[PDB]
Amino acid sequence: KQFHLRAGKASYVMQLFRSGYLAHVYWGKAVRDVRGARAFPRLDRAFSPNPDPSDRTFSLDTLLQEYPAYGNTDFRAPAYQVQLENGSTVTDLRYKTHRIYKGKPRLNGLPATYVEHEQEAETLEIVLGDALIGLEVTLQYTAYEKWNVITRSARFENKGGERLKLLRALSMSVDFPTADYDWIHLPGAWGRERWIERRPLVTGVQAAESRRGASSHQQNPFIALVAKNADEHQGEVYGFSFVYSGNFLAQIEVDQFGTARVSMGINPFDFTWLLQPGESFQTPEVVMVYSDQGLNGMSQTYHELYRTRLARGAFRDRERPILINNWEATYFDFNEEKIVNIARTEAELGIELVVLDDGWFGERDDDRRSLGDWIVNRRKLPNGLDGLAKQVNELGLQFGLWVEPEMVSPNSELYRKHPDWCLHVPNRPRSEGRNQLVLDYSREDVCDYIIETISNVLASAPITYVKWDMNRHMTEIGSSALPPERQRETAHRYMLGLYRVMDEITSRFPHILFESCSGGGGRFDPGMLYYMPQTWTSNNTDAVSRLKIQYGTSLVYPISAMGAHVSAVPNHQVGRVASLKTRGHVAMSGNFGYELDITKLTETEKQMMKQQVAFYKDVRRLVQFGTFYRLLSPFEGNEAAWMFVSADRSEALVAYFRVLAEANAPLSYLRLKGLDSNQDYEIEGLGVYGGDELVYAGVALPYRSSDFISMMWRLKAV
Amino acid sequence: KQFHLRAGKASYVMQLFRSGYLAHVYWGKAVRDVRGARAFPRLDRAFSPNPDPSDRTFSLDTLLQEYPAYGNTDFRAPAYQVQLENGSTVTDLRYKTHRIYKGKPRLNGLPATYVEHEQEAETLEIVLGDALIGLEVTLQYTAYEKWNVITRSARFENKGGERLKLLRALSMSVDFPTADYDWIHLPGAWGRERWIERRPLVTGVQAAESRRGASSHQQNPFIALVAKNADEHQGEVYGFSFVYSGNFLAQIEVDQFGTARVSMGINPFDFTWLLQPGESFQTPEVVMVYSDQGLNGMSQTYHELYRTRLARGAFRDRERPILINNWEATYFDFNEEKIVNIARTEAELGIELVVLDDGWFGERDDDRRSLGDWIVNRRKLPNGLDGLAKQVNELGLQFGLWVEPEMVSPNSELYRKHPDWCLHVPNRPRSEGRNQLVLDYSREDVCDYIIETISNVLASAPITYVKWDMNRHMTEIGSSALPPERQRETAHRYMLGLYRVMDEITSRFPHILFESCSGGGGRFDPGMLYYMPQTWTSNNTDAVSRLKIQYGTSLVYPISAMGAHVSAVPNHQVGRVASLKTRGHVAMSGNFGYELDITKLTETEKQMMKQQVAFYKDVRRLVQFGTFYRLLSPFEGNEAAWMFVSADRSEALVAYFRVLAEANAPLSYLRLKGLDSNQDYEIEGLGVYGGDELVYAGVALPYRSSDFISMMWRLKAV
Amino acid sequence: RVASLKTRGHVAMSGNFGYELDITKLTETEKQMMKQQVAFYKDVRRLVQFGTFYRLLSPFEGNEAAWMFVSADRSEALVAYFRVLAEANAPLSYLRLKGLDSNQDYEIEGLGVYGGDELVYAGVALPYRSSDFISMMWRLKAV
Amino acid sequence: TLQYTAYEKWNVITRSARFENKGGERLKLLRALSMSVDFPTADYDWIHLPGAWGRERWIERRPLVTGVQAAESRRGASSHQQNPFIALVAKNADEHQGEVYGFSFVYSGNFLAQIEVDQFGTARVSMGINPFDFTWLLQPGESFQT
């Protein structure tokens, strides 16, 4: 009774064990069969108790599992926990049945990777049941044909007659037979998101998580098990990505016998879910990638999958517009005239989109006001949004708009009309982040209001781009529309609310390109990517700081979603002064755009901008849709390097960066990846090199002085 | 508004911040005053919300705290969590008052370090309160005078009108300003407890814990923060020791701004506690030790504190008897005359105590019955316990007894009479560990029964030693005597019951030496030490295996409590053969005893055994009550070495071990510690050497082949 | 050091095999093992002395050592594993292989048929054993 | 005369040197290594085989230092103490993957196996007869084969 999923060139094997226990067998490089699945030593481990008195070699404490519970002989951390009306927490899921079918189901009220044709994937659903309490859990497995991807999630259902309180409901859990690995997660903060941290495993618990109601800048919902010797170019890697934008827990526990349990899902902390008879609960999915091609092999799988089978809309496969954003340029101090007058210059430079950022609404002259009042400031924009958008359109420029619809200012019309529409708890002070509060997206009336309000704004002007921002994390989490026993469900219901709001709004406007934002990359997760196919990577726009942030972000997320802007110097976040050329090379390594005051630019700088725009337009398709290879890590030394390669490996773009200059420095050489050994490539300006020479020997690098230098080479097969 | 605790050579500083918030300031080497406590950048951190909207530079997400809560601006893991009747989990403790007095309070129904006189320590009680709900929390701080010891614990009291659910109640929490450390915990398993593991911190969460209802073989309730360069002999070390024998969480969280939060206490997992209006909850204490003299300096503080101010009873300061366990010589199948016959020759060898092991009661002919039926088996012991003991006494030997009162066999009179007296949950199969169930010590009827039954046994014979064992961990945790809303209090109430049972039984028999046991060192924790002055370290008695186990155990626990017995070869646990010489040396480096069939011993082996007993009596006071220094780590190489030094540094005993033999090996040397460099030392049978030479230069170790060797030097000042 | 005869043979059979000890001092049960050791080595001598050699586990990096010999056509192989110091209640052991044909199945003498990919990519579960200085050897033949 | 041989089926390059005095003066060879090669970079570990009697050829992996590292013999024999073999390996290279550069000396007497990293991060690997306590006179017409 063995289950065997074939994902790309990887195998995921499970089997039934004894009285309907579901056991994990193997996840790794594709094997035709796992014949030794039951041929392992059966031991009576001291202090591992027994559910079956007739066989003391069997314990749940020593069985590799797919969805373990605590209480009936397993002492490791459970993937789920349920409290009964009697107060006990013992549950006992046994195999009930299963089904296999081509394709991939939609998950209720949630984002998920999808397929366009049934042949793209295969789905396995294993239904488990606890007969005593009527609890049924359907474990969902999906294997893509094309990629080494296994997606996992679980669906709880109360088919009994009692109330069932879910204390914990993780999406997945898997017991590795050994624990000789390092783990990688992506810790950070505002202005420095997703730094790569590699650590050895400990005997105990290690976890990245979020209790912020948002996936957060502080810890990104991604962990990975990597072989001790694995790097960017080789070695076994096991990726775990969470398709959800709220609270999460990503945990690895190593037990007394050297087994490693990796579990991921909605953070159990401050979380409960009540299941009345007949009610169900669907967890978000976790996308699991195996690679033996090292970190690049893993990332390249995530890039393709997320770009073509998670991101949606009309712009999913379209090249993204080069934009100018006015936030760093003017902040709140702007008007219609200053924007329209500079637009002519912007069009001349080759810019394709003008984005009006924060401050266009209500009395938004600072960050302490008017959130929730999405009416145009007639003083700042006399002709309104429609006037500005049309003026901008006439110059051959698209018009974009910034919104932050999940928020409400205490000093606003909306809050004076509906003070109870925010997240709060009875009789407690309402803490503020950036002088704002969070709207209760768990309430339907609030969600209905937002959908209608924002739709009116988006329909009042020829807007073809929206920047959906969110600049605060939840405190005093609660809702006045939920009973006491469902209060702990507030944070998740909020996220379900937001997903529904975004789904409806984005579907009402198929011609709009939505970019998600959260004070930078505070919600750069797969869940948001499903609703908005690109993201503002970070508020830190410094070329050097962006080396780490973009390198780290590229670990999971496709370049097409990674927004990057050239900003002014001295940089507004760190004060660093880098040349325009270097700033361009870093921004052109992502979703290229601008964010600076053009009226303060010299003719030389404006002329360099025009050439930057022309160049990026020439390599845009390659950058945003080509294959990405990381070459030199800014976390390991003084250099950063990467390259983009087309599908047929005929064209390539190479980018190199050295931050700190060293006097009388050694000669440097860059080796490339992903090129065809049997072909020659003309490096633009250098000469014809062999594909093998560029990969096995590398190219000598020009000796250069000064800090923060950059170099780009266009490669073309000959 | 600065609190300054002064413990030995250490300082612990706190201050009131703004509107009655309690902030952490400093914990380290003693300073007269911390004048820069408020002189730090008051920064506005992005996404760190403000309890006061007017001031963006204040946030609980960025305040170093003493007892942090979640929900009102802090996003790090909290020290405590309370759920209200309205479903919310938001609380807000503010400073109310504080009291300072000489001495140290006893904790209600719990073990704790103590004082014999007021002047030994100073206690600070900070009273916090959430006026909205009438929740009063008293933070208890005690600072010893002669030791760098700070003890912390919290006492909850509901002075409100509504009921409150503690979802989490840790004993302490502390935020270090920086996080550039490693951490040390003691993972393990049965037969290999408390191995030392040193790991670098991760930006995120690390933890050691136990969900087994017992402190466990798998993770000892102890963690430490150590400086990156700290070793056994030098460097800053911060130790955390939990005085509790049930479930625990020992966690270190590192946040976005390089802060490290260390928190410890009863495991929040599967735990709640209901506070009706007027009810209290006292947490166990955590003992916090600082040292700048490496891991030895930390351990030596723990050893002295725990041996003289935690352990209790008539045997606290008394030398512990060399005992023999005749278990492996007969197993269950023994009788009165078989015991008295071998006891005669054991008295000839110099043994002082004979321990009658499992099988003496009910129908214990195997490990499958009779647990709970604590009456003398008249088939095996026709003259009862009193008959056997008095025969043992008239040989000059003490009589000891083995019991396991926390357990009940399904096949027993007790279970047939009271099947509901075990830990269980309705309608669920009662899982067994080693063919037995666990008695529900959360109930008073069970506790009162055990107390009386065990007392009758201990009073029926001249028994001066009791080995209290427990060979199974809790499953299906629940109580038929508890209402559904208190079910999750079962495990903790179990431990409170066991603490009360042990307390009353040990009180009734002051002339008895109690040794706690749990399949080896399954509860080798400070809580048990309070009730029983010594503990059986491990069921693995193999000399080489014992090196790591004893090295690790000594990190927190004194040698006086660390049982070590000589056993037969080939070893029953690993199958290793090591000579009796080294088996003796390993065991003499702890609380010495024997566990082997003497009838199967050769005349050579019986000769050496006589010398070992004679030798240990000479060095017993030094080993059991001297200062302990670790010299070579079995976790770091092929060797192991440690030494005992008297308080006046006039005597010392050195032990050295080498595991694998190396052909044509380099000459080895061993540097000592703890000696007075001004004096010269007589090494018996070797010569006189200066203390400086022994410490700064070292002793040349004799070249020797064959595996698993050992050496012992006796040192005496001139 | 006192190691078993099986262990010593397994180590010596991983090189140019021979003997250097006093046969007159050996027991009868020991002599019968020598006969088997000599016989066994002859069966695999060509493979051992002329096959392709792969190191799997380093004794410089831990408590284990393991290597294997593979025929030039990858149809025959021989695997040796060694653990030095035993530990009580030890975790389960697994050994991955190298140099096998992935597209073929192999029959391990004493165990059964296993896929070549399975042995190399998943590995094989090792028997739980106590006592110091242990060794195991397995002949592999493609089906 | 620098001698290079490249095998067809194996990744093997062999190197040796042949001296010859065609002039009219005496020539004393103070040093005559078999080969020497300059790597463009020095980001490698190095492996050599140190040992003793009863424990020959233990594997030792070390990072490179900026300066001189060497395994050698002055015993008139290749010796137990150091085997005439060194290797440059990539930092992440192991038994099953990664770039490795082996250097094996076909000689049974004294040897010098040296790696030298200079100020510009290049790594000079040189091997041959140990120059220590070694000279060789070449009269006009005489030759020397390494």
Ligand SMILES: OC[C@H]1O[C@H](OC[C@H]2O[C@H](O[C@]3(CO)O[C@H](CO)[C@@H](O)[C@@H]3O)[C@H](O)[C@@H](O)[C@@H]2O)[C@H](O)[C@@H](O)[C@H]1O
């Ligand atoms: O409002 C437009 C702006 O909003 C988003 O980001 C704003 C970002 O800025 C703040 O960071 C700072 C740093 O301390 O915080 C203070 C005030 O809170 C500001 O002076 C300063 O900028 C906020 O704290 C963050 O909450 C917030 O993320 C968006 O990312 C921007 O692109 C832009 O649209």
